[PDB]
Amino acid sequence: GHNDYKYIIHPKNRWYKAWEMFILVWAIYSSLFTPMEFGFFRGLPERLFVLDIVGQIAFLVDIVLQFFVAYRDTQTYRTVYKPTRIAFRYLKSHFLMDFIGCFPWDLIYKASGKHELVRYLLWIRLFRVRKVVEFFQRLEKDTRINYLFTRILKLLFVEVYCTHTAACIFYYLATTLPPENEGYTWIGSLKLGDYSYENFREIDLWKRYTTALYFAIVTMATVGYGDIHAVNLREMIFVMIYVSFDMVLGAYLIGNITALIVKGSNTERFRDKMNDLISFMNRKKLGRDLRSQITGHVRLQYDSHYTDTVMLQDIPASIRAKIAQLLYLPYIKKVPLFKGCSTEFINQIVIRLHEEYFLPGEVITEQGNVVDHLYFVCEGLLEALVTKTDGSEESVTLLGPHTSFGDISIICNISQPFTVRVCELCHLLRLDKQSFSNILEIYFHDGRTILNNIMEEKESNDRIKKLESDIVIHIGKQEAELALKVNSAAFQGDFYQLKSLIRSGADPNKTDYDGRSPLHLAACRGYEDITLFLIQEGVDVNLKDKFGHTPLFEAVKAGQEGVIGLLVKEGASFNLEDSGNFLCTTVAKGDSDFLKRLLSSGMNPNSEDYDHRTPLHVAASEGLFLMAKMLVEAGASVISKDRWGNSPLDEARLCGNKKLIKLLEDVKNAQSS
Amino acid sequence: KLESDIVIHIGKQEAELALKVNSAAFQGDFYQLKSLIRSGADPNKTDYDGRSPLHLAACRGYEDITLFLIQEGVDVNLKDKFGHTPLFEAVKAGQEGVIGLLVK
Amino acid sequence: GEVITEQGNVVDHLYFVCEGLLEALVTKTDGSEESVTLLGPHTSFGDISIICNISQPFTVRVCELCHLLRLDKQSFSNILEIYFHDGRTILNNIMEEKESNDRIK
């Protein structure tokens, strides 16, 4: 709709196409008649007058039309409707010749004192053969007809044109001589049969034309009958020039036809392949059925035309990707191996696929070889056959549409578990193990999904044991790096990044190199948003790192009691081995606040110590009252015994702190019941 | 558009780089960390655990990385949030050769 | 000037230096080199990276017009599975090549 200038016409309007054809017909006629108007008639007969003028007029308007037809720029590839640009292009290309051609040179020649030099300008009208040249250019662009065969037809038109012009020029060279010396011309001295071509300027124009054209065609195939031959020196020079150009042009014609034949066709090539295979088949006396299999494979490869699958590579990645998806993605999205996989990973699988057709009865993979090709069955049916040491074949399963095989072999880097034979006419999609491995390293989450798929119902029936080949090891390593960055985010806040990482298919539960989970990190840093987000994700919560610290413990050390409350709501335990010992070391620290936090988390199991001394015993020995107080209220019984078997009340009696002794004594009286 | 968390998402990555180095230290991927350090790295970078790459290396008892870390003068007496020194990382894992090195 | 292996990339052909001169280098991220020992006639590069299945530890670059014999990596492995018992000697040569296989123990 960019044609704001409505008057400017597209170069494709069906009426302009009709005008192209019409002016092509007139161009052919005018460029085939101008030599005849030059040679045979020295000044057009009056009868043809209108025919002359009309012809010229027909090329006019055409010039006018070429001033109003938009063109496709060769640097922007946009139809330039800009009238100024169209006018300028035409006025600087193919205008000047058209304009001089359209001048009525016939009338000029009659007017300007019958001077031949004016008639020489008629040849400017042969630039109208440009239209035929363009017609052949368009036809050669068209794929309906063989470009090389259109080259052959172009050569035939050029040959016809040269013979016609040569005939006209030859007759002209006969007429340049004055009519008194016509006996020294090729036509004046021609006595073909009884007829003598004397006084040739008076013969019917068709007799003269067919005579001259007869010679032209005779020389065209170099039959050189001789009946009509050059006699003067001008006629011998012209015949020399003609004969030479015709030699080269005929050589070009034979060259083009021979190139057309030698280039050959796909049918020819496949026929040759079949004939060589038939020679082999008869040489070894093969069995009809086996011959049928051989011929069937050849037919399959010839009909498939696999080269196009490579040809698609030349298409840029966007359109090539649309091709790959539109033709393969439907099948691949239904593959159970890829079930749940992210769409982009599947898209890459599609980009790296290779269509392969196999005849029924063939074998794709043999057991014992390492499969480096993951084939997804799209069409047809295959069969799974296990060969045993005894030499027997078991039909384990049948692989139909939207199925797969080779994934286990590639993943665990084992030999092919079972021979895969073909039942129906099969269309599969092979994928290189190398490319597959690269893609699985691209998407470590979808790689883990692939592992889960193979281990989900098939599980480890094919000896699937954790790290395998390199892809599994790479997957684990990359998940480790991902968990490192997850915990880094949990250290530097960045709640958006935490969201994005987890929602990108990353499992939060995976800890770092030190066993510290992102929930452990959130507890250590007290990032309430982060702790809540991982709680929504769902972590063991009671998980402890490799060195025995639950997130509860680290949060207690950092005093992140909101985080602690969320955990205990979810259900949180210190999971401290020797927890009584650690509480005794806390008593050694003397931090009542730390101890209060530890107790508030619900840890007072009276676990005593290696010395069998409860933290209450330790505090009593220290003389502590307040810390002993909250230890008693937390649950530490006064009846608890040390290594000596003495109560913390006994140890306070040793200390002698009357307030501590009375406190433990009152609690002892309360508890004795 | 209304999305600008990019520089927030990287957050300098100085520690993230340190994490990468210490990761290699764990998996004993010397080449990975070798390439990090010729591209520029240091042990005191440590991590959010406070553990330097040498801590993890001693935890694993890879004498190769331990000798190399010593070669660039890597701090051993450096402590971590764990309180566990690289010496103690080595002894706890029974890496008697690495304990010999770190005592050296 | 040509480059045959890229550091950090598992080599797929074990090459042998029949003629010419090559050089071993470390392509740092900083765009600097380390110029590991050159490869003169009758040496093999890419060997350990295949035998040990490790990533190529150095980029190799061509210094003079070099004539080389190629053996595919998967070849070298299946030669090991086919042509048994020499891989032990090859492995000992690797072991002495490094410091008790300090590079790949």
**Residue-wise DSSP of A564-583:** HHHHHHH------TTHHHHH
B-chain residues near A484 (CB < 8 A): 16, 19-20, 23
A189 known member of a binding site: no
Alpha-helix runs per DSSP H in A429-527: 433-442, 444-456, 471-491, 495-503, 518-525
What tokens does A182 get?
Answer: 């016509």
Alpha-helix runs per DSSP H in A334-414: 343-351, 407-412
B-chain residues near C54 (CB < 8 A): 31
Alpha carbon A32 to its chain centroid, in Å, reads 51
A45-50, long-range: CB within 8 Å, 24+ apart, which pairs? none
What tokens does A356 get?
Answer: 């392969």
Tokens 């011309």, residue located: A185
Residue type, C61: R
Phi, psi of A429 (to 5 degrees): -130, 100
B-chain residues near A497 (CB < 8 A): 5, 8-9, 11
What tokens does A84 get?
Answer: 């100024």
Phi, psi of C68 (to 5 degrees): -135, 150
Can you say whether the dihedral through the CA atoms of C44, C45, C48, C53 is positive or negative? negative
d(CA A427, CA A355): 7
Name the residue facing B16 among A477, A488, A513 (closest C-beta).
A488
d(CA A540, CA B55): 27
Q: Of all helices (H) and strands (E), which one includes residue A314?
A: none
**How many residues are present in chain A?**
673
Name the residue facing B31 among C8, C28, C29 (closest C-beta).
C8
C-chain residues near B66 (CB < 8 A): none
**How many residues are present in chain C?**
105
CA angle (A154, A159, A164) in 5-degree steps: 130
Q: Which of B16, B31, B49 to mutate to test binding with chain A, by most A CBs within 10 Å of its CB?
A: B49
C1 known member of a binding site: yes
C45 known member of a binding site: yes
What tokens does A166 get?
Answer: 């040569």
B-chain residues near A524 (CB < 8 A): 48
Phi, psi of A178 (to 5 degrees): -65, 155
Interface of A with B (CB under 8 A): 477, 480-481, 484-485, 487-489, 491-492, 494, 496-497, 500, 512-514, 516, 521, 524, 547
Q: Of all helices (H) and strands (E), which one includes residue A377?
A: strand A373-379
In angstroms, what CA-CA distances link A198 with A184, A189, A194? 11, 7, 12
CA distance to partner chain A, nearest, from residue B76 (Å): 19
Q: Method used for this model?
A: cryo-EM
Residue type, A455: M
In angstroms, what CA-CA distances link A246 with A217, A232, A252, B66? 11, 21, 9, 88
d(CA A420, CA A6): 66
CB A111 within 8 A of CB A100: no
How many other C-beta atoms lie within 10 A of the C-beta of residue C37?
9
Tokens 């006064």, residue located: A638
- State whether residue A69 is helix, strand or coil: strand
Q: Decide: residue A375, CB within 10 A, 0-12 exposed, 13-18 middle, 19+ buried.
A: buried
Q: Which residue of B has its CA nearest to C54?
A: B31
Residue type, A664: L
CB distance B35–C102 less than 8 Å? Answer: no
B-chain residues near C8 (CB < 8 A): 31, 35
What tokens does A40 get?
Answer: 């045979």
Rg from Cα positions in chain B: 15
Listed residue (C65, C23, C58) closest to C40, CA to CA = C23
Alpha carbon A612 to its chain centroid, in Å, reads 73
d(CA A251, CA A249): 5
d(CA B52, CA B66): 12
With left for phi above 0 and alpha for psi between -120 and 50, is residue A624 left, alpha or beta? beta
Torsion angle of C-alpha atoms A524, A530, A533, A537, degrees rounded to 10: -40
Interface of B with A (CB under 8 A): 5, 8-9, 11, 15-16, 19-20, 22-23, 26-27, 48-49, 51, 56, 82, 84
Name the residue facing A494 among B11, B19, B51 (closest C-beta).
B11
Resolution in A: 3.2
d(CA A108, CA A100): 12
**How many residues are present in chain B?**
104
CB A653 within 8 A of CB A661: yes
Listed residue (A281, A305, A307, A279) closest to A293, CA to CA = A281
d(CA A499, CA A486): 10
CB A591 within 8 A of CB A631: no
CB distance B31–C55 less than 8 Å? Answer: yes
B88-95, long-range: CB within 8 Å, 24+ apart, which pairs? B89/B55, B89/B56, B89/B58, B89/B59, B90/B58, B90/B59, B90/B61, B92/B59, B93/B58, B93/B59, B93/B60, B93/B61, B94/B61, B95/B58, B95/B60, B95/B61
Residue type, A315: I
**DSSP label at A124?**
G
Interface of C with B (CB under 8 A): 8, 26, 28-30, 54-55, 57, 102, 105
Residue type, A328: Y
A523 CB-near residues (< 8 Å, 6+ apart): A531, A551, A552, A554, A555, A558, A560, A563, A564, A567
d(CA A427, CA A407): 18
- State whether residue A375 is helix, strand or coil: strand
What tokens does A264 get?
Answer: 């050959």
Q: Which of A511, A513, A516, A545 to mutate to test binding with chain B, by most B CBs within 10 Å of its CB?
A: A513
Chains near B with 3+ CB pairs less than 8 A apart are A, C
CB A364 within 8 A of CB A433: no
Residue type, C87: G
A-chain residues near B20 (CB < 8 A): 481, 484
Chains near A with 3+ CB pairs less than 8 A apart are B
Residue type, A146: N
C-chain residues near B38 (CB < 8 A): 26, 28-30
Q: Decide: residue A130, CB within 10 A, 0-12 exposed, 13-18 middle, 19+ buried.
A: middle
C29 CB-near residues (< 8 Å, 6+ apart): B35, B38, B39
In angstroms, what CA-CA distances link A495 with A490, A593, B9? 8, 30, 9
In angstroms, what CA-CA distances link A254 with A166, A259, A265? 21, 8, 19
Residue type, A426: C
Q: Which residue of C has its CA nearest to B38?
A: C28
What tokens does A617 get?
Answer: 């015993």
Angle between helices B96-103 and B53-60 (to 10 degrees): 140
Terminal-residue alpha carbon distance, chain A = 100
CB A230 within 8 A of CB A184: no
Residue type, C15: Y
d(CA A254, CA A249): 9
Listed residue (A198, A166, A171) closest to A182, CA to CA = A198
- State whether residue A180 is helix, strand or coil: helix
CA distance to partner chain A, nearest, from residue B7 (Å): 10
Q: Of all helices (H) and strands (E), which one includes residue A8?
A: none
Name the residue facing B5 among A496, A514, A516 (closest C-beta).
A496
A608 known member of a binding site: no
Phi, psi of A453 (to 5 degrees): -60, -45
Name the residue facing B82 among A484, A488, A547 (closest C-beta).
A547
Listed residue (A188, A180, A232, A233) closest to A212, CA to CA = A188
CA angle (A83, A88, A93) in 5-degree steps: 130
Name the residue facing B15 among A488, A494, A514 (closest C-beta).
A488
A422 known member of a binding site: yes
CB distance C26–B38 less than 8 Å? Answer: yes
Residue type, A517: S
Q: Which of B35, B60, B65, B71 to mutate to test binding with chain C, by most C CBs within 10 Å of its CB?
A: B35
CA angle (C53, C58, C63) in 5-degree steps: 130
Q: Which of C6, C29, C34, C100 to mutate to test binding with chain B, by most B CBs within 10 Å of its CB?
A: C29
What tokens does A44 get?
Answer: 């057009």
A-chain residues near B84 (CB < 8 A): 547
Angle between helices A495-503 and A528-537 (to 10 degrees): 10
Name the residue facing B39 among C29, C57, C105 (closest C-beta).
C29
Q: Decide: residue A426, CB within 10 A, 0-12 exposed, 13-18 middle, 19+ buried.
A: buried
Name the residue facing B64 among C29, C55, C102 (closest C-beta).
C102
With left for phi above 0 and alpha for psi between -120 and 50, is residue A10 left, alpha or beta? beta
Alpha-helix runs per DSSP H in A264-341: 266-284, 288-304, 307-311, 317-333
Burial per residue of A477-486, b for 16 or more beta-carbon CB atoms within 10 angstroms, e otherwise? bbbbebbbbb
Name the residue facing C30 among B31, B39, B64 (closest C-beta).
B39
In angstroms, what CA-CA distances link A25 with A16, A132, A286? 14, 9, 61
d(CA A636, CA A583): 12
Query: C45 has which bridge partners?
Result: C15
CA distance to partner chain C, nearest, from residue B85 (Å): 25
Torsion angle of C-alpha atoms A340, A341, A346, A352, degrees rounded to 10: -120
d(CA B29, CA B51): 17
Q: Pairing state of beta strands A382-387 and C13-19? A: unpaired
CB A446 within 8 A of CB A440: yes
Q: Which of A487, A488, A500 to mutate to test binding with chain B, by most B CBs within 10 Å of its CB?
A: A488
Residue type, A159: E
With left for phi above 0 and alpha for psi between -120 and 50, is residue A427 left, alpha or beta? beta
